[PDB]
């Protein structure tokens, strides 16, 4: 049958109260299976269902290293959005990213996702074609031009079409 | 395995 995998990453800035809170949650079909929260004592990716215990410590280690990077991506890009939208560095703001893959009954890709939201509004999304982008406003248009010149679409497409699908089946087999 | 590091906004 059809299946899906989705990751949701959000970061909320804490004006003069420390660094942004970074959370990431994975979903297989529509159920949470993995989670990372920067606010933890020892922040690392954690199995949210018992069948994810099957993955060895290398898996968790490697996956945790990605989160650390993402956290850094979020702090910087939060500050650049303050720039585009001409806001003060004293207010709370939120940047969200969601990506993943839907597979068809034949196991192959049905739809890939890679999209971003700022303060609860759409920012930029990869279209279903996995070649073009939809920009919600003036500011996201800046990102669209940059991304069109730098081959961003082909970069995300590589992950969405291959690894994302392969790990989905990997998790399904564990389940 | 997760998506690689995203591009600059």
């Amino acid at each position: 049958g059809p299946h899906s995998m989705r990751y949701f990453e959000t970061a909320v800035s804490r004006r003069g109260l420390g660094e942004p809170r970074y959370i990431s949650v994975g979903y297989v079909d529509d159920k949470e299976f993995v989670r990372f929260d920067s606010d933890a004592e020892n922040p690392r990716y954690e199995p949210q269902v018992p069948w994810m215990e099957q993955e060895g410590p290398e898996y968790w280690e490697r996956i945790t290293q990605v989160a650390k990077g993402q956290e850094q991506w979020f702090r910087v890009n939060l500050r650049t959005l303050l720039g585009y939208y001409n806001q003060s560095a004293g207010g709370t703001h939120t940047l969200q990213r969601m990506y993943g893959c839907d597979v068809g009954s034949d196991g192959r890709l049905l739809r890939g996702y890679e999209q971003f939201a700022y303060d609860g509004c759409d920012y930029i999304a990869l279209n279903e074609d996995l070649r073009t982008w939809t920009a919600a406003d003036m500011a996201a248009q800046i990102t669209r031009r940059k991304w069109e010149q730098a081959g961003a679409a082909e970069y995300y497409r590589a992950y969405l079409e291959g690894e994302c699908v392969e790990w989905l089946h990997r998790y399904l087999k564990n389940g | 395995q997760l998506s690689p590091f995203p591009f600059d906004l």
Partner: T-cell receptor
Amino acid sequence: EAAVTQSPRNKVAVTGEKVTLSCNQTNNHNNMYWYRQDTGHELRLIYYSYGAGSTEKGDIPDGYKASRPSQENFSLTLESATPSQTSVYFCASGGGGTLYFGAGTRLSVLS
Amino acid sequence: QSVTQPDARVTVSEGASLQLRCKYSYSATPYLFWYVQYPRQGPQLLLKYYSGDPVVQGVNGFEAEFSKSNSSFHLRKASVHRSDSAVYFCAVSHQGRYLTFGSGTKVIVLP
């Protein structure tokens, strides 16, 4: 691509000296990198930055320190220059995917 | 090692065809690049592969072919010139956070 510039281009340092290598990029790139190349062959990563305030230990960070005070400047400090730190040093920037290198900083150490 | 260049040096006659072999063991999604380093210079981007057409074109009449089945990103120039003499580096992205370079192939063009 020619928007990354390093300073100095050529140095002869003395052992124990504090040596600061400077990098400026006007590519509006968030990611900056310091590699070193000894053999005219492999480039090994020392330190990198995800943006202002970010500093990340590479594969061989020992004896080095880095500073990213702003988006355009990324400096590499040798606290106390040692002969083993003799190398060609390359700064790079990236906005995702590909990286763009500076022309290089030839560093010699005199004992 | 994430990328392997099996030949340290290669010699070809002017106007002949060049193949530079590259192999990767990177298990995740391979983002691949070829860089050219001219004497006393920083490495310059030739071409890259993210996805799509496995045959990609670079600057200076360079092309490379991605092959998943052979885990290779071999480089080609149909007709080499005197000035192609330089060192060539294969590179693979480390989870999108920076590049990991091969050992590099030195190309000698016999006039």
